[PDB]
Amino acid sequence: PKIHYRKDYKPSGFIINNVTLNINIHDNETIVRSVLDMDISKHNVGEDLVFDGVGLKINEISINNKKLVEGEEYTYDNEFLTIFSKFVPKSKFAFSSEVIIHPETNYALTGLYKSKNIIVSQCEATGFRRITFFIDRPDMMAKYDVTVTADKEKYPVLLSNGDKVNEFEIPGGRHGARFNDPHLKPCYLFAVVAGDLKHLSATYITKYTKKKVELYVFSEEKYVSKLQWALECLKKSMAFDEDYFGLEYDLSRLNLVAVSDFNVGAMENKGLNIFNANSLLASKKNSIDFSYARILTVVGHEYFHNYTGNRVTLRDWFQLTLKEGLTVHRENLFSEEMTKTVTTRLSHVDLLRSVQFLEDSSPLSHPIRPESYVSMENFYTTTVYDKGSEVMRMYLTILGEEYYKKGFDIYIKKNDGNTATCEDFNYAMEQAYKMKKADNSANLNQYLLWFSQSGTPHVSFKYNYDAEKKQYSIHVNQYTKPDENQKEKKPLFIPISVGLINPENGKEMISQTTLELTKESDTFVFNNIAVKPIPSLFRGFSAPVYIEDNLTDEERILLLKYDSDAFVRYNSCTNIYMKQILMNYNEFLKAKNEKLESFNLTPVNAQFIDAIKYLLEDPHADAGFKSYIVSLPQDRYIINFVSNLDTDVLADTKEYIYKQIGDKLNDVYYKMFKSLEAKADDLTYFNDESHVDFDQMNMRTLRNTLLSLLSKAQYPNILNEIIEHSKSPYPSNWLTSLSVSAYFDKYFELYDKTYKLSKDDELLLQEWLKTVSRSDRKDIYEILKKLENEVLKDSKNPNDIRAVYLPFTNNLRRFHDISGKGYKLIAEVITKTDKFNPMVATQLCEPFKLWNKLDTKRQELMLNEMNTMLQEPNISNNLKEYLLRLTNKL
Template sequence: MRTETPQPIRLSDYRPFPFEIETTHLSFQLEPSATRVTATLQVRRTGAAGEPLSLNGERLTLKAIAIDGQALSGNQYELDDERLTIADVPDAFELVTEVEIDPSANKALMGLYMSGGRFCTQCEAEGFRTITFFPDRPDVLSRYTVRIEADVSFEHLLSNGNLMEAGQLKNGRHFAVWNDPFPKPAYLFALVAGRLDVLEDDFVTMSGRTVALKVFVDPGQASRAAYALDALKRSMKWDEEAFGREYDLDLFMIVAVRDFNFGAMENKGLNIFNSSLLLAEPETATDFDYERIESVVAHEYFHNWTGNRITCRDWFQLCLKEGLTVFRDQSFSADMRGAAVQRIKDVKALRARQFAEDAGPLAHAVRPSSYLKIDNFYTATIYEKGAEIIRMLKTILGADAFRAGLDLYFERHDGEATTVEAFVACFAEASGRDLSSFFSWYEQAGTPSVSLTHAYDAAAKALSITLTQKTAPTSGQPVKKALPIPVTIGLLSQAGAPLRDSEVVLLEGESLTVRWEGVAETPVISALRGFSAPVTLTTDARPADAYVLFAADP
């Protein structure tokens, strides 16, 4: 039993892992209470000479360990409840470990566990360390080959990538071999084995490749996955058209399971969903159920590029994949279901969940500087405010410069584990703008309050608008910086006719006054159109202005 006080993990303490795991070969001998996992790692030193190899590992029974074919004795490594450490290793070598685990006893639903009589995995954020010894951190990318062997009663043997080989063995067992050609971190590993029904289709990509699509569900439930499969095809098409992102494997699979900690998980080529977020039928499902299925299917698919092909250097960068992917799935839903309706839903959810989080004792930055346990940071701030930051970036830069920045990000960092700094740098380079102050949105907790006052000069037909901002202190951040806040403003006449089209006013300091000429009459000011920034807004509008805005504000 651990009795020591947990120590915070700090962003400032980040150091690269001193070894590269070039390839990872996993062999699973699946048994519900005694699964054997043999891991063969091709390791190459990238750090300083003499550094030990330290691998994460929890709840593992070590059966064998060898380097370059030579078994290690007990005095050649150190093993405790959390790590396997080998002090003396060559600069390049093959490490083989064999462990035994008990999936049936795994009630935490992290790592490899049993659900409904099937084997299933959940590895984000730190579950892979309960499967085998490995550097369980997102900046260690490796190419995986996985061999699964199980009793034939476990009909389907699934893992990441493309199926390379499958067949029958003696003693009523069978096997499958999977290869994922794209390097990925351990948290994206997945395995499912069991009796399942499958709904199949295919998708032809923009380059003419045919991708097989398969949704695996409980026996008898295949018809309830039809809407999810159709949503997947719409998501794949939309990502090509909106962002130029084409799917990269020959096969895309989704598995629905009943016992799952997350709503869904974007494992490369093998998404795993809680059944409640994948299955629906007209007799029992509501419109909201269908909307939610469409949104979550899209979100997990979009992670293939924003999270999988490009992943996080460390867990402090979680918003890099989640905030960006929420922005993408919100944009998809806006195109599928109407932009205005979707934006209202997204803002209502943001104000209800994230604003409350920012106003409370658990307020934290979108890119935090420390944590005790990363599982606690899968929050509305990381996801929803993270998405709003991306939206503000698009508002400030404009659609064309934003797309150019995102294209540069995909091109430059494909196959890498990167940072928020590198992400923002791509937009600065593509747009030619200094975005150094914009980065404060990632580092500062709290919801800014913006006030708007105005003065209209009837003789000069000129309008002056003054914007000011303030952010209340939050825990650990008593002093707040002024943030660059895009406030989209339009003007209406007293009759509701447009006087001036929408314009983005960028409030960069504590206060800003703009003067607009040629305003023919006392205007009704329509401010923060489209909820252009995640702020609270107060104005000096007259009560009667609210009726005009209600009737005519676009």
């Protein structure tokens, strides 16, 4: 296909200074008239003027009021408008076009589209070209004057970026509104919305300059009651950027708008952030707990882009991580601050080490700054986002808070109102590093390898203690596996946050310190170490790596009980589970392949189980943390450690381990499930959509995790508890009652009960679909067909499609049915969805990413479905690129 390379970046021959748009919405067409005030740059060599413009119907084209004609002065092929160089002026000129577009049939949700009864845009990355002609790349910065007109009854609220400077009536029951956005921007940050929207509003006064900012949050009328928590989260986001980063908002007004049909979470259009409704709307009677967290993070994220993305933007799309990795890091700092729970940071680590590590070991592996693409849209990945964020976070670990803040301000101020590159960020952080080291020859040149080198480093350790000298050494090695991006991998700058625990008394033996590993291996020596320690390594998960702790399970148990760092405690537990999972998996696999009539399994370590019980019974230990220790590692995590994985053998492995532990702990689990009830389900704040007690939410999470364990175990009379739980006013509880009832005859009664509770709220119904989809049912295939026929039907809403299918794809036993029927079902959905929404179709490909990790029968079945999809006529460039890369053809 058509491949863009990072190395070939060149500035344009043209400049666009001002954009003046009139967008006239009618029932069966929208007319877009656009004037671009343009000029020739210093890089111009008299080339043709080529605009991006996809699927536009041309009404008229002119330059300086001279009409241009197709075949004579221009060509248009439905993708690019070429104005021949003879007709391109040599100094400042006005380019005029008028085109017709059709939001009402735009089911791809990119460009201008209709979502229920709201007209909305999505322009990042390449959507502005589906609205009007432009040099649609992020270095083409301009100022925008936008007029929107529409039928007043249908579309009473009209929004675009920036200050509303006029509103006017138009004959025939229409009206208009004009916007001026004074901030220079790329076209990917343009937005318009038209709808019958309702709002909540508040005034925010900025901390330093005392600027009054009007905050509006919008939804369709039915769901206006679900806007309050978003507004609160916006205030929190603003205060956080003021308090931590010294950054104030820069317009008089900020609008946030929920729409039902959206490809991803939300979008940072200047002054007009647009959200998937699932990431803006909640109410405590109609939303699960996880919604509150999601809204907090997504509102935060879009808000933080106002500097990291908007005020400082991208030179080109290869720099994507500069805005997304950095914004996710800001969002994560914010979330950790607002929730004050250790499970926040653990949740980010869990996501990285499951999904992103899988990606990084797959044929899709890329560095956080890719070298090439066909469709830029395929690079909005957990690598670019989540590994990017960890790369952005490592600067803070290396520098500390004070020097990190200095470097960040160098960056943000130097590049204000302009484009930037990853190098500019690394240069700013390098100035801070020099200051920190008090050495103007220190450099971060090695650090750039985190942007250019793909793959996850493996860091391993060896320890030695000299009792006579009271001297302890940690010898560290790093390795990155060669891959298609680099045949020779170089050592990275890896910060290793470390503590040392005395195993006798469980106490800290050193000031926490950060080891700076820069070579392939190094030995770090500590004096005045009074007894042999147990090391507490990569505290806070200080780099995005595979950690090989080389600790015994006895040492791991001591850290789990006694270490200060929540990640090291969690990882020590993770490691004990992984050792057991790999050992039992190999035992089961050998028995199966050798057709043994009898064999042995290694039992779960009894001292580890005792440790779990000790933590669970400690009334002062954290409820969220407890829910992580009784859960095995996620399947996507486990699979990074197994080649030729037999998923059935893995399923049997996990069941054996869970059963071993429950045989010891179920009575503890039951006692805690009951004892936590009063505090977990207390109704303090149940009517307050401005405040969430995240500790209490983690108590519900722990109850629900325990209830699942006990239900799968068939603990005596647990069905009574399941039925009581379905009467709870918390949706998290009553939907958990449905999933845990899977193990009982009462499942279809709870299916109906909860359906009735969910069906009248669009977002709650989607959460019910996910609950059904992930249910541990032998008849799941018949249940999915019932969802398709009775609920999903012909929906093109990405949230409905994702809700029905993705959870099911995580059913290890059923999705990977050795017949291949799981792979076939999802491939049919992908191909169907690709005919109207290529981005969503590529999202639905997610289960196939691990195909070359599976046993060879399942590899063959997956491959056969991937190649079937590839053969589909009129396959999108998005899906075709994804599948060609994934199957080692590109």
